[PDB]
Amino acid sequence: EWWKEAVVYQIYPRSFYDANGDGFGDLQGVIQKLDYIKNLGADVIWLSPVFDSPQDDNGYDISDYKNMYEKFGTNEDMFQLIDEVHKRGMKIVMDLVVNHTSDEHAWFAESRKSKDNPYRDYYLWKDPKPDGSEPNNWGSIFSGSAWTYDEGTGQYYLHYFSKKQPDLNWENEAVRREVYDVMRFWMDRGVDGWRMDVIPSISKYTDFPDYETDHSRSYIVGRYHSNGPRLHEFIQEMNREVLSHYDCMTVGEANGSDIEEAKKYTDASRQELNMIFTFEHMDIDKEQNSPNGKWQIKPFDLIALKKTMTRWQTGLMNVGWNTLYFENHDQPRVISRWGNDRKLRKECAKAFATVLHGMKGTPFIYQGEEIGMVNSDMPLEMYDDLEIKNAYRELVVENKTMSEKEFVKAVMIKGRDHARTPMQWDAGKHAGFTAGDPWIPVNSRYQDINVKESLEDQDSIFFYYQKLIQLRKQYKIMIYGDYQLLQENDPQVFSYLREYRGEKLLVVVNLSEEKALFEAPPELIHERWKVLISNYPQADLKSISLKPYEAVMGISI
Numbered sequence: 161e162w163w164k165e166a167v168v169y170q171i172y173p174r175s176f177y178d179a180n181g182d183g184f185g186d187l188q189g190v191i192q193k194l195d196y197i198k199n200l201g202a203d204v205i206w207l208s209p210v211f212d213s214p215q216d217d218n219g220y221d222i223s224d225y226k227n228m229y230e231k232f233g234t235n236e237d238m239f240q241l242i243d244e245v246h247k248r249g250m251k252i253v254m255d256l257v258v259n260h261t262s263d264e265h266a267w268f269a270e271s272r273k274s275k276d277n278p279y280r281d282y283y284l285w286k287d288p289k290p291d292g293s294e295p296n297n298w299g300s301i302f303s304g305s306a307w308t309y310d311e312g313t314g315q316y317y318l319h320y321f322s323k324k325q326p327d328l329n330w331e332n333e334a335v336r337r338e339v340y341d342v343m344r345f346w347m348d349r350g351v352d353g354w355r356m357d358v359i360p361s362i363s364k365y366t367d368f369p370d371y372e373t374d375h376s377r378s379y380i381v382g383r384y385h386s387n388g389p390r391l392h393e394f395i396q397e398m399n400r401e402v403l404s405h406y407d408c409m410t411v412g413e414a415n416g417s418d419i420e421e422a423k424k425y426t427d428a429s430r431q432e433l434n435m436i437f438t439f440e441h442m443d444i445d446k447e448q449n450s451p452n453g454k455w456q457i458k459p460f461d462l463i464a465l466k467k468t469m470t471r472w473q474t475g476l477m478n479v480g481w482n483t484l485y486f487e488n489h490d491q492p493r494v495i496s497r498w499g500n501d502r503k504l505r506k507e508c509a510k511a512f513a514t515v516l517h518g519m520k521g522t523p524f525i526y527q528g529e530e531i532g533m534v535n536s537d538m539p540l541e542m543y544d545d546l547e548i549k550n551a552y553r554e555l556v557v558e559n560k561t562m563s564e565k566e567f568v569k570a571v572m573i574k575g576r577d578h579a580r581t582p583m584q585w586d587a588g589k590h591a592g593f594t595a596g597d598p599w600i601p602v603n604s605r606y607q608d609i610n611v612k613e614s615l616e617d618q619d620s621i622f623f624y625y626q627k628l629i630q631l632r633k634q635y636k637i638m639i640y641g642d643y644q645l646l647q648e649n650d651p652q653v654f655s656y657l658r659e660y661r662g663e664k665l666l667v668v669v670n671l672s673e674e675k676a677l678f679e680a681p682p683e684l685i686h687e688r689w690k691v692l693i694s695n696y697p698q699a700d701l702k703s704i705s706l707k708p709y710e711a712v713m714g715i716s717i
């Protein structure tokens with residue numbers, strides 16, 4: 161299946177390329193950079209959402225599923241992009257955002273008018289408690305309550321995300337039909353698949369029970385916010401009504417998912433989705449459940465990474481399918497977060513890439529990951545994301561569960577905007593992103609980190625990624641082989657083995673700044689190896705003295 165063998169490149173289009181000079185990346189800009197992506201070697205593009213939206217959550221608050229936001233272009237520009245993707249032998253996946261819409265979507269503008277409106281039951285409306293307060297103690301992921309009051313009609317509406325992202329009512333069959341008609345509209349025009357935004361949230365517990373009260377916080381995000389009673393029923397209905405009618409790929413964004421849930425979504429026999437993004441490996445550097453959420457930082461712990469990635473590799477080894485990612489539009493640059501982004505930036509970027517691309521699953525490359533883009537030193541006032549604005553207000557100003565200094569430090573490590581500063585094309589003004597003024601500043605280190613310098617340097621992170629993708633297309637063991645963690649207890653080295661039809665692939669990566677040692681276990685000592693890739697210049701893999709961030713992948717001969 162082409163989706164098993166794919167390498168996906170995720171574009172965050174407002175930050176990719178600005179062809180028309182307004183500072184906002186656009187769909188013709190994407191078209192003009194497709195040759196670059198094909199030369200890297202990715203065969204599938206996932207576009208973050210370009211549908212009409214007032215941009216409260218930068219496109220994830222959609223106000224029209226059948227038209228583009230004007231700064232991206234028009235549907236004609238989108239149809240051309242689909243065509244240009246296909247002319248290059250590639251595929252395009254769009255972002256399906258159907259847990260919620262914008263409050264400016266015509267559906268919601270109508271819903272909120274009156275209880276008798278035909279759109280009233282497209283959304284989730286509930287009476288206040290007798291004292292006027294919210295139906296329950298559920299929280300929003302972007303801080304505060306999940307409920308907002310509408311004075312006109314005397315009810316609250318639910319939003320798991322912002323107050324400008326009212327949640328759709330999937331109990332109403334008319335809403336399910338509306339979603340399936342959106343999907344067919346785009347698929348009939350050549351969209352090859354969907355990345356499904358917060359897909360585990362679409363089914364609600366319609367009794368809306370309170371969470372057990374904590375004492376540490378007023379609003380709670382927990383187990384009712386996902387995996388509702390009708391979740392898999394709905395995904396199975398979407399497959400029958402839509403996905404089964406096209407040659408397509410689907411990936412669900414699945415924050416909160418564990419390995420058994422992943423098998424419910426991804427086991428082919430269940431006729432749901434092809435794969436999902438879990439957050440469990442993204443969650444290793446926060447406390448389990450602080451009121452400060454992901455902003456309650458912990459240092460990188462390689463043993464925690466090895467345990468989580470291994471549970472996923474073994475859990476979906478012979479049923480379902482994994483996604484493989486360290487970066488996306490919601491995550492910091494991994495080398496800044498967990499590694500060295502200075503003197504060992506190249507070695508480190510290549511080392512995290514080798515850990516990831518040596519595994520079973522579909523790899524995702526976030527725009528700029530392939531040139532080693534890094535987190536930004538911009539001051540807090542320059543950040544754009546509503547998530548930061550809302551968390552500063554709740555955690556620092558109001559509840560005082562984080563100090564100013566601690567919050568600033570956490571945002572410098574994990575703010576989503578580190579992913580969103582423009583793609584770095586060359587060393588000229590605004591890194592070649594725009595001839596105008598970019599919507600957020602370009603990262604201050606762009607003169608040293610960009611596509612131009614990368615293509616001029618044979619030792620670039622770019623060529624290393626290009627090689628990993630080539631290897632994947634040449635060596636079927638990388639796609640189909642099983643997985644075994646080796647040297648499990650080593651606190652510096654992530655090593656593992658893939659096996660397929662009597663061939664072995666050995667991946668050994670020192671995720672640390674200091675020297676380390678890998679010794680092959682006893683069963684492998686009489687293997688002969690050929691080195692397929694390494695991030696140091698100078699094949700006896702039974703014993704490897706590893707330099708800082710040294711990575712090597714060998715195949716048995």
Ligand SMILES: [Ca+2]
Nearest residue numbers: 178180184186
């Ligand atoms: Ca533009």
